[PDB]
Short mmCIF file of C-alpha atoms in Angstrom, two decimals:
data_model
loop_
_atom_site.label_atom_id
_atom_site.label_comp_id
_atom_site.label_asym_id
_atom_site.label_seq_id
_atom_site.Cartn_x
_atom_site.Cartn_y
_atom_site.Cartn_z
CA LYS A 127 -163.82 194.59 30.56
CA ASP A 128 -163.38 197.80 32.88
CA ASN A 129 -165.70 200.65 32.02
CA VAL A 130 -167.84 198.35 30.27
CA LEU A 131 -171.74 197.22 31.31
CA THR A 132 -172.29 193.34 30.87
CA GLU A 133 -175.33 192.52 28.96
CA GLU A 134 -177.33 192.04 32.33
CA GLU A 135 -176.09 195.60 33.49
CA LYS A 136 -177.52 196.86 30.15
CA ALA A 137 -180.80 194.46 30.94
CA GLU A 138 -181.44 196.07 34.33
CA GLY A 139 -180.75 199.65 32.80
CA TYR A 140 -177.55 200.47 34.07
CA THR A 141 -175.33 203.26 32.10
CA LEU A 142 -171.82 204.56 32.21
CA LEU A 143 -171.60 207.10 34.82
CA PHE A 144 -167.51 207.33 33.86
CA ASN A 145 -166.67 206.74 30.04
CA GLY A 146 -163.32 205.12 31.27
CA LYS A 147 -161.79 207.71 28.90
CA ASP A 148 -162.65 210.91 30.10
CA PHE A 149 -164.82 213.46 32.32
CA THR A 150 -167.26 213.82 30.00
CA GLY A 151 -170.44 214.46 32.72
CA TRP A 152 -168.27 215.73 35.18
CA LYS A 153 -167.48 219.35 36.63
CA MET A 154 -165.83 220.46 39.49
CA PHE A 155 -168.03 221.24 42.80
CA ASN A 156 -168.72 224.78 42.42
CA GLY A 157 -166.31 225.17 38.96
CA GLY A 158 -166.29 224.33 35.40
CA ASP A 159 -164.32 221.85 33.37
CA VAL A 160 -162.50 219.12 35.77
CA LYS A 161 -159.07 219.52 37.27
CA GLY A 162 -156.57 218.49 39.68
CA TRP A 163 -157.75 215.20 38.72
CA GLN A 164 -157.07 212.85 35.28
CA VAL A 165 -157.91 209.72 33.53
CA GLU A 166 -154.95 207.35 33.15
CA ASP A 167 -155.54 204.01 31.96
CA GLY A 168 -159.16 203.47 32.16
CA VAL A 169 -159.03 205.18 35.87
CA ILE A 170 -160.16 208.32 37.57
CA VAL A 171 -157.31 209.30 39.19
CA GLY A 172 -157.17 212.10 41.97
CA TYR A 173 -154.23 213.44 43.25
CA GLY A 174 -155.73 215.13 46.40
CA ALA A 175 -149.21 227.94 40.21
CA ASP A 176 -148.07 231.54 41.12
CA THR A 177 -151.36 231.42 43.42
CA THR A 178 -151.92 230.32 47.12
CA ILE A 179 -155.42 229.58 46.77
CA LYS A 180 -157.24 226.59 47.80
CA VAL A 181 -160.27 226.12 46.60
CA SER A 182 -162.87 222.28 46.72
CA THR A 183 -161.37 219.85 44.65
CA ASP A 184 -163.90 217.41 44.77
CA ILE A 185 -165.82 216.47 41.29
CA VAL A 186 -169.69 216.37 40.87
CA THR A 187 -171.91 215.15 38.07
CA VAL A 188 -173.07 217.73 35.87
CA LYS A 189 -176.57 216.06 36.16
CA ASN A 190 -178.78 216.31 38.98
CA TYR A 191 -180.08 212.98 40.58
CA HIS A 192 -183.22 211.77 42.96
CA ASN A 193 -183.54 208.43 42.70
CA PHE A 194 -180.63 206.30 41.68
CA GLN A 195 -178.47 203.06 42.25
CA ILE A 196 -174.90 203.53 41.70
CA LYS A 197 -172.01 200.91 41.50
CA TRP A 198 -168.46 201.70 41.57
CA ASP A 199 -165.00 200.42 41.77
CA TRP A 200 -162.31 202.39 44.15
CA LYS A 201 -158.71 202.21 45.74
CA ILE A 202 -156.77 204.60 48.35
CA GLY A 203 -153.42 205.16 49.24
CA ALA A 204 -152.21 204.53 52.70
CA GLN A 205 -153.73 207.57 54.98
CA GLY A 206 -156.15 208.25 52.33
CA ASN A 207 -159.65 209.99 52.68
CA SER A 208 -162.24 210.10 49.87
CA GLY A 209 -166.07 209.53 49.69
CA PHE A 210 -168.91 209.35 47.65
CA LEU A 211 -171.56 212.01 48.35
CA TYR A 212 -174.81 212.22 46.57
CA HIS A 213 -177.94 214.95 46.30
CA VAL A 214 -175.10 217.78 46.93
CA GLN A 215 -175.76 220.98 46.09
CA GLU A 216 -173.87 223.94 44.98
CA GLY A 217 -173.52 227.67 45.11
CA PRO A 218 -171.57 230.58 47.09
CA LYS A 219 -173.39 229.43 50.61
CA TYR A 220 -171.27 226.29 50.55
CA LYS A 221 -167.25 225.49 50.14
CA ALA A 222 -167.73 221.66 50.36
CA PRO A 223 -169.95 219.14 48.98
CA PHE A 224 -170.39 217.97 52.67
CA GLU A 225 -172.37 220.55 53.70
CA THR A 226 -175.60 219.05 52.16
CA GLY A 227 -174.70 215.84 50.65
CA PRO A 228 -174.49 212.65 52.33
CA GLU A 229 -171.58 210.81 52.32
CA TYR A 230 -170.39 207.23 51.67
CA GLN A 231 -166.94 207.22 53.55
CA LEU A 232 -163.91 206.03 52.00
CA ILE A 233 -161.10 206.22 53.92
CA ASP A 234 -157.94 204.40 55.45
CA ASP A 235 -159.80 202.85 58.49
CA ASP A 236 -156.40 201.68 60.71
CA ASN A 237 -154.22 204.07 59.29
CA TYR A 238 -156.01 207.66 59.03
CA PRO A 239 -154.14 210.37 61.35
CA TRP A 240 -156.55 210.80 63.24
CA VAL A 241 -155.66 211.88 67.17
CA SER A 242 -158.23 212.57 69.43
CA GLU A 243 -159.41 214.70 71.85
CA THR A 244 -157.67 212.82 74.55
CA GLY A 245 -154.30 212.24 72.77
CA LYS A 246 -155.75 208.34 71.32
CA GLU A 247 -154.83 208.01 67.54
CA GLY A 248 -157.36 206.43 65.14
CA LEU A 249 -160.61 207.10 63.50
CA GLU A 250 -163.67 205.94 65.66
CA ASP A 251 -165.60 203.25 63.75
CA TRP A 252 -168.52 205.42 62.75
CA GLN A 253 -165.76 207.51 60.66
CA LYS A 254 -164.62 204.77 58.89
CA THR A 255 -165.10 202.69 55.24
CA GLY A 256 -168.93 201.83 54.27
CA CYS A 257 -170.09 204.64 56.89
CA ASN A 258 -172.69 206.96 56.05
CA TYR A 259 -171.01 209.66 57.52
CA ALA A 260 -171.87 210.88 61.38
CA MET A 261 -175.21 209.16 60.59
CA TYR A 262 -174.34 205.09 60.44
CA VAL A 263 -172.34 202.30 61.01
CA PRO A 264 -171.88 199.13 59.67
CA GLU A 265 -172.07 196.19 62.59
CA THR A 266 -169.80 194.01 60.07
CA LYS A 267 -167.74 194.59 57.18
CA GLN A 268 -164.87 193.69 54.45
CA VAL A 269 -162.96 196.49 53.55
CA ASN A 270 -159.40 195.79 51.66
CA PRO A 271 -156.50 197.38 52.97
CA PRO A 272 -155.14 200.77 50.93
CA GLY A 273 -153.54 199.91 47.98
CA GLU A 274 -156.25 197.08 46.94
CA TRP A 275 -159.33 197.48 44.63
CA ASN A 276 -162.94 197.23 46.67
CA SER A 277 -166.48 197.58 45.22
CA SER A 278 -169.16 199.56 46.44
CA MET A 279 -172.90 200.32 45.87
CA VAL A 280 -175.59 202.91 46.94
CA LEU A 281 -179.06 202.71 46.09
CA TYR A 282 -181.57 205.61 46.89
CA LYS A 283 -185.64 205.44 46.11
CA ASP A 284 -187.91 207.93 47.44
CA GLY A 285 -185.82 208.16 50.79
CA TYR A 286 -185.27 204.22 51.20
CA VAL A 287 -181.15 203.91 51.47
CA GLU A 288 -178.54 200.95 50.93
CA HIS A 289 -175.01 201.24 51.07
CA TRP A 290 -172.70 198.17 50.11
CA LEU A 291 -169.90 197.02 49.97
CA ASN A 292 -167.62 194.10 48.58
CA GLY A 293 -170.76 192.51 47.70
CA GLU A 294 -172.37 192.67 51.50
CA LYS A 295 -175.52 194.77 52.58
CA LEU A 296 -173.68 197.18 54.83
CA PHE A 297 -177.01 198.80 56.28
CA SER A 298 -180.31 200.27 55.19
CA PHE A 299 -182.47 203.10 56.37
CA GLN A 300 -185.17 205.41 55.57
CA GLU A 301 -184.77 209.20 55.62
CA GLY A 302 -188.65 209.55 56.75
CA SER A 303 -187.72 207.33 59.89
CA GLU A 304 -188.08 208.80 63.17
CA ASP A 305 -184.49 206.81 63.95
CA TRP A 306 -182.94 208.96 61.06
CA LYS A 307 -184.50 212.33 62.57
CA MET A 308 -183.24 211.64 65.23
CA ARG A 309 -179.76 211.24 64.33
CA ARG A 310 -179.71 213.97 61.59
CA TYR A 311 -181.19 216.85 64.46
CA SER A 312 -179.03 215.68 67.56
CA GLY A 313 -176.53 213.96 65.91
CA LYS A 314 -173.52 216.56 64.36
CA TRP A 315 -175.10 218.63 62.12
CA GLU A 316 -176.00 222.29 64.05
CA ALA A 317 -173.37 223.77 61.56
CA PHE A 318 -174.98 223.06 58.60
CA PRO A 319 -178.29 223.44 58.34
CA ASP A 320 -178.54 222.45 55.03
CA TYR A 321 -177.33 218.89 55.43
CA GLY A 322 -179.98 216.84 53.91
CA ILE A 323 -181.35 219.82 52.50
CA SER A 324 -182.60 218.58 49.17
CA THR A 325 -183.48 214.93 48.36
CA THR A 326 -182.41 216.16 44.90
CA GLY A 327 -179.16 217.16 43.56
CA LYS A 328 -175.32 216.08 42.23
CA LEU A 329 -173.47 212.69 42.48
CA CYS A 330 -169.94 213.54 43.97
CA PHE A 331 -166.37 212.06 44.26
CA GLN A 332 -164.38 213.95 46.99
CA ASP A 333 -160.26 213.93 47.56
CA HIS A 334 -159.31 215.28 50.93
CA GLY A 335 -156.30 213.38 51.46
CA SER A 336 -153.20 211.31 48.95
CA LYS A 337 -154.62 210.00 45.25
CA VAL A 338 -157.71 207.93 45.28
CA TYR A 339 -158.64 206.04 41.97
CA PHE A 340 -162.12 205.04 40.49
CA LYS A 341 -163.06 203.25 37.74
CA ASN A 342 -166.61 200.81 36.68
CA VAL A 343 -168.60 203.88 37.52
CA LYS A 344 -172.06 202.41 36.46
CA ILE A 345 -175.46 203.52 37.24
CA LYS A 346 -179.14 202.76 37.07
CA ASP A 347 -181.08 206.29 36.91
CA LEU A 348 -184.44 204.80 38.95
CA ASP A 349 -187.93 206.80 38.92
CA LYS B 79 -205.27 192.29 93.07
CA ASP B 80 -203.31 195.32 92.12
CA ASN B 81 -199.70 194.68 93.93
CA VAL B 82 -199.59 190.71 93.73
CA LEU B 83 -198.15 188.43 92.30
CA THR B 84 -199.90 185.73 90.18
CA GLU B 85 -199.15 181.92 91.18
CA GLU B 86 -197.69 182.22 87.48
CA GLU B 87 -195.92 185.09 87.82
CA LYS B 88 -193.73 183.25 91.28
CA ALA B 89 -193.47 180.05 89.32
CA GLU B 90 -191.69 182.28 86.79
CA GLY B 91 -189.32 184.15 88.84
CA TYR B 92 -191.09 187.66 89.77
CA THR B 93 -190.92 189.35 92.55
CA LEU B 94 -192.87 192.58 93.95
CA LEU B 95 -190.50 195.60 93.71
CA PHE B 96 -192.93 197.75 94.91
CA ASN B 97 -195.45 196.01 98.10
CA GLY B 98 -198.25 197.99 97.76
CA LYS B 99 -197.98 199.17 101.11
CA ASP B 100 -194.59 201.22 101.53
CA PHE B 101 -191.26 202.13 100.16
CA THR B 102 -189.68 199.21 101.97
CA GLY B 103 -186.81 198.25 99.32
CA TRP B 104 -186.31 201.88 97.99
CA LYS B 105 -184.17 204.83 98.94
CA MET B 106 -183.64 209.02 98.06
CA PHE B 107 -181.35 208.91 95.46
CA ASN B 108 -178.02 209.37 97.30
CA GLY B 109 -180.11 209.50 100.66
CA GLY B 110 -182.21 207.61 102.85
CA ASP B 111 -185.76 207.50 103.89
CA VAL B 112 -188.04 208.48 100.79
CA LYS B 113 -189.58 211.90 101.03
CA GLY B 114 -191.77 213.83 98.24
CA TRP B 115 -193.32 210.93 97.67
CA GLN B 116 -196.34 208.71 98.78
CA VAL B 117 -197.85 205.65 98.97
CA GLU B 118 -201.37 206.57 97.97
CA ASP B 119 -204.24 203.81 97.89
CA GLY B 120 -201.52 201.06 96.59
CA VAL B 121 -200.03 203.58 94.38
CA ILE B 122 -196.41 205.09 94.38
CA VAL B 123 -197.23 208.99 94.25
CA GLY B 124 -194.57 211.28 93.24
CA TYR B 125 -195.27 214.68 93.61
CA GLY B 126 -192.32 216.55 91.35
CA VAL B 127 -181.02 218.56 94.42
CA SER B 128 -182.73 215.27 93.32
CA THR B 129 -185.70 214.00 94.97
CA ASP B 130 -185.56 210.78 92.69
CA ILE B 131 -186.08 206.91 94.39
CA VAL B 132 -184.29 204.20 93.51
CA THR B 133 -183.87 200.32 94.65
CA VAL B 134 -181.66 199.72 97.54
CA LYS B 135 -180.39 195.96 95.59
CA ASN B 136 -178.36 196.41 92.53
CA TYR B 137 -179.78 194.28 89.27
CA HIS B 138 -177.14 193.01 86.58
CA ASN B 139 -179.72 191.60 84.43
CA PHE B 140 -183.37 191.95 84.89
CA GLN B 141 -186.78 192.11 83.68
CA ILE B 142 -189.35 194.44 84.79
CA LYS B 143 -192.36 195.22 84.40
CA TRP B 144 -195.01 198.13 85.80
CA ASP B 145 -198.03 200.57 85.35
CA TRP B 146 -197.83 204.19 85.45
CA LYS B 147 -199.92 207.22 85.07
CA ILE B 148 -198.51 211.12 84.47
CA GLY B 149 -200.54 214.24 85.53
CA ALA B 150 -200.49 216.94 82.95
CA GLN B 151 -196.99 218.12 81.77
CA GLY B 152 -195.37 215.50 83.72
CA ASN B 153 -191.65 214.48 82.77
CA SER B 154 -190.83 211.37 84.24
CA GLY B 155 -188.73 207.90 83.98
CA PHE B 156 -187.52 204.57 84.83
CA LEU B 157 -184.05 204.36 85.40
CA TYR B 158 -181.75 200.92 85.19
CA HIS B 159 -177.92 200.63 85.71
CA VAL B 160 -178.16 204.00 87.84
CA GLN B 161 -174.46 204.65 90.24
CA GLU B 162 -174.62 206.74 93.28
CA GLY B 163 -172.42 208.91 95.26
CA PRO B 164 -170.71 212.12 96.01
CA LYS B 165 -170.03 212.56 92.27
CA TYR B 166 -173.39 212.27 90.98
CA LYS B 167 -175.93 214.88 91.03
CA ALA B 168 -178.36 212.82 89.18
CA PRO B 169 -179.67 209.18 88.24
CA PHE B 170 -179.41 210.10 84.46
CA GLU B 171 -175.33 210.78 84.99
CA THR B 172 -175.40 206.78 84.76
CA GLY B 173 -178.51 205.09 84.12
CA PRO B 174 -180.02 204.79 80.97
CA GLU B 175 -183.69 206.06 81.16
CA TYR B 176 -187.31 204.83 79.85
CA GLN B 177 -189.15 208.23 79.09
CA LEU B 178 -192.66 208.24 80.78
CA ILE B 179 -193.45 211.99 79.65
CA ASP B 180 -196.96 214.13 78.45
CA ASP B 181 -195.59 214.13 74.85
CA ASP B 182 -198.24 216.13 73.20
CA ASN B 183 -198.71 218.93 76.47
CA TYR B 184 -194.81 219.26 77.44
CA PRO B 185 -194.06 223.06 77.19
CA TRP B 186 -190.68 222.67 76.71
CA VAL B 187 -189.26 225.48 73.74
CA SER B 188 -186.50 224.86 71.18
CA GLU B 189 -183.80 227.00 70.63
CA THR B 190 -186.00 228.52 67.19
CA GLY B 191 -189.14 229.39 69.88
CA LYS B 192 -190.86 226.28 68.51
CA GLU B 193 -192.82 224.49 71.39
CA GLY B 194 -192.91 221.00 71.80
CA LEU B 195 -191.28 217.65 72.29
CA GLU B 196 -189.90 215.94 69.52
CA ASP B 197 -190.86 212.31 68.64
CA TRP B 198 -187.32 211.57 70.19
CA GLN B 199 -187.86 212.71 73.66
CA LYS B 200 -191.22 211.50 73.92
CA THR B 201 -192.83 208.26 76.06
CA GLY B 202 -190.75 205.20 75.49
CA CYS B 203 -187.42 206.61 74.03
CA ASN B 204 -184.26 205.50 75.59
CA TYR B 205 -183.74 208.75 76.34
CA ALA B 206 -180.70 210.39 73.89
CA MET B 207 -180.35 207.10 72.44
CA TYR B 208 -183.67 205.91 70.85
CA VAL B 209 -186.98 206.52 69.27
CA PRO B 210 -189.61 204.14 68.12
CA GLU B 211 -190.54 203.84 65.06
CA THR B 212 -194.56 203.21 66.17
CA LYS B 213 -196.25 203.09 69.56
CA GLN B 214 -199.34 203.31 71.65
CA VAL B 215 -199.54 205.80 74.48
CA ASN B 216 -202.57 206.28 76.62
CA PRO B 217 -202.70 209.92 77.16
CA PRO B 218 -202.13 211.60 80.86
CA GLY B 219 -204.40 210.32 83.66
CA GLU B 220 -204.91 207.10 81.86
CA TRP B 221 -202.92 204.07 82.90
CA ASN B 222 -199.97 202.64 80.59
CA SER B 223 -198.12 199.40 80.72
CA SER B 224 -194.55 199.16 80.34
CA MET B 225 -191.48 196.38 80.53
CA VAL B 226 -187.71 196.88 80.15
CA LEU B 227 -185.40 193.85 79.80
CA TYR B 228 -181.40 193.90 79.94
CA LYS B 229 -179.70 190.61 79.90
CA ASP B 230 -175.78 191.18 79.15
CA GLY B 231 -176.54 194.22 77.09
CA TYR B 232 -179.26 193.18 74.75
CA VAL B 233 -182.02 195.52 75.71
CA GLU B 234 -185.89 195.54 74.75
CA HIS B 235 -188.27 198.80 75.48
CA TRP B 236 -192.61 197.45 75.47
CA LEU B 237 -195.21 199.79 75.94
CA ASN B 238 -199.06 198.79 76.18
CA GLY B 239 -197.66 195.28 75.35
CA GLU B 240 -195.72 196.09 72.10
CA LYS B 241 -191.88 195.87 71.68
CA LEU B 242 -190.58 199.91 70.78
CA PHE B 243 -187.30 198.55 69.68
CA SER B 244 -184.16 196.60 70.82
CA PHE B 245 -180.91 197.20 71.18
CA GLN B 246 -177.33 195.80 72.03
CA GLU B 247 -174.90 198.09 74.41
CA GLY B 248 -171.26 198.03 72.81
CA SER B 249 -173.04 197.25 69.17
CA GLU B 250 -171.42 199.62 66.53
CA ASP B 251 -174.96 201.27 66.26
CA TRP B 252 -175.14 201.51 70.25
CA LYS B 253 -171.30 203.36 70.41
CA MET B 254 -171.72 205.84 67.93
CA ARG B 255 -174.85 206.89 69.57
CA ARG B 256 -173.07 206.79 72.75
CA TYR B 257 -169.97 208.68 71.72
CA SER B 258 -171.36 211.13 69.15
CA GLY B 259 -174.45 211.92 70.73
CA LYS B 260 -174.87 214.17 73.85
CA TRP B 261 -173.32 212.96 76.33
CA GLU B 262 -169.76 214.57 76.59
CA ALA B 263 -169.95 216.46 79.60
CA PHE B 264 -171.16 212.53 81.57
CA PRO B 265 -168.60 210.12 80.86
CA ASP B 266 -170.05 208.01 83.23
CA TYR B 267 -173.45 207.62 81.64
CA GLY B 268 -174.08 203.65 80.39
CA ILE B 269 -170.26 202.57 81.72
CA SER B 270 -171.53 200.61 84.62
CA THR B 271 -174.00 197.31 83.77
CA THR B 272 -174.73 196.90 87.01
CA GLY B 273 -176.26 199.49 89.67
CA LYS B 274 -179.68 200.76 90.81
CA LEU B 275 -183.34 200.53 89.28
CA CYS B 276 -184.69 204.11 89.32
CA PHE B 277 -187.96 206.44 89.18
CA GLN B 278 -187.78 210.03 89.00
CA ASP B 279 -190.61 212.81 89.00
CA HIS B 280 -189.10 215.99 87.04
CA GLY B 281 -192.73 217.62 87.18
CA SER B 282 -196.27 216.93 87.87
CA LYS B 283 -197.52 213.70 89.84
CA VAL B 284 -196.65 210.52 88.69
CA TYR B 285 -198.17 207.03 89.87
CA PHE B 286 -196.64 203.70 89.92
CA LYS B 287 -198.05 200.30 90.70
CA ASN B 288 -197.99 197.19 89.75
CA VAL B 289 -194.27 196.63 89.72
CA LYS B 290 -192.87 193.06 89.59
CA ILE B 291 -189.39 192.28 88.73
CA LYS B 292 -187.18 189.12 87.14
CA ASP B 293 -183.61 188.99 88.50
CA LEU B 294 -182.24 187.20 85.48
CA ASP B 295 -178.92 185.04 85.54
#
């Protein structure tokens, strides 16, 4: 059942973005073949040397995408921080995919060790799972705790974006909109002038904390 | 019939916030008698420290409608739930603002050297919080009508009969805008849900009339 298209998914035009067995279709951000992640038991596992050099361990698609609809299943560890990013650009100008590609946050909402300015522990709600990081936050959502599987989906079609989680539409927005522009250009991206620099780019899974697990990664390449 | 309640308006609970004659019911922000403003032909006229005007009365829930006009390059506003006191230099530090500004001819220059306001700094915005997707504004020297409703944190902005947007204070979206946006230097912004109503003028003439208020439950 895992990593297999249903007849209805094939009918809708989904194909496997992860084949269940290896990293065919994937590469390291700013790198070559995938390392520091493994396929184990039909699951992509991210682990997050006579060497001290530290480079991005995030994985990106080889293929560039414009419009798409992607579904995936995911599991994090306690205190995990991962994410799905889209329209990511690579190059020596960048150290990380978040500098260019918008992020669907995958994080330990309740127990990620973030201590605020004032000495208050805990992520703010706009930094939690299913948010379009530093742009949009759901009013309500349902997330299974760390160690349990979750299902997510992102649709992008000519700037129209939807975030879904565990069967529910969290929100949608339009990149063209006045509201989007306000959030983009007066929110938190001063240091990242290339954030959303392009509506075409790579798709990406990140690991910045603990182990993370992905499977059932199915994609509709849209017109 | 400017500055006169219709029988219907009285029946639905509106009263005059401006009487058409003088500044009864108003004071200077952090001050006493109104100065820097004049009543001219039944119109509140601002000439543009804070020299803004605030209601003597505090409001929690309310619905206010008003007519306004600005001079060229005008930068004015309606603000609500304003707090006063020595700790505050200006009404914007506490009360959200419905912007009244010369959208197209305001000589502000950005950090890159481009002149002019971005759309989220223009008329009808809830300053630094919300922006309309579409609106209809009559240009400087012409009259406009506006309305703001506040009901237990639910807010609407209207301009010339159109609902620009609504929002809910304390929603996740509102909290994100409030604490990720531009207010770190203003910790009391938008915290109190009761306070004064306010007109401000930060440049050029502004004109207000037909200022009618419902004091809601």
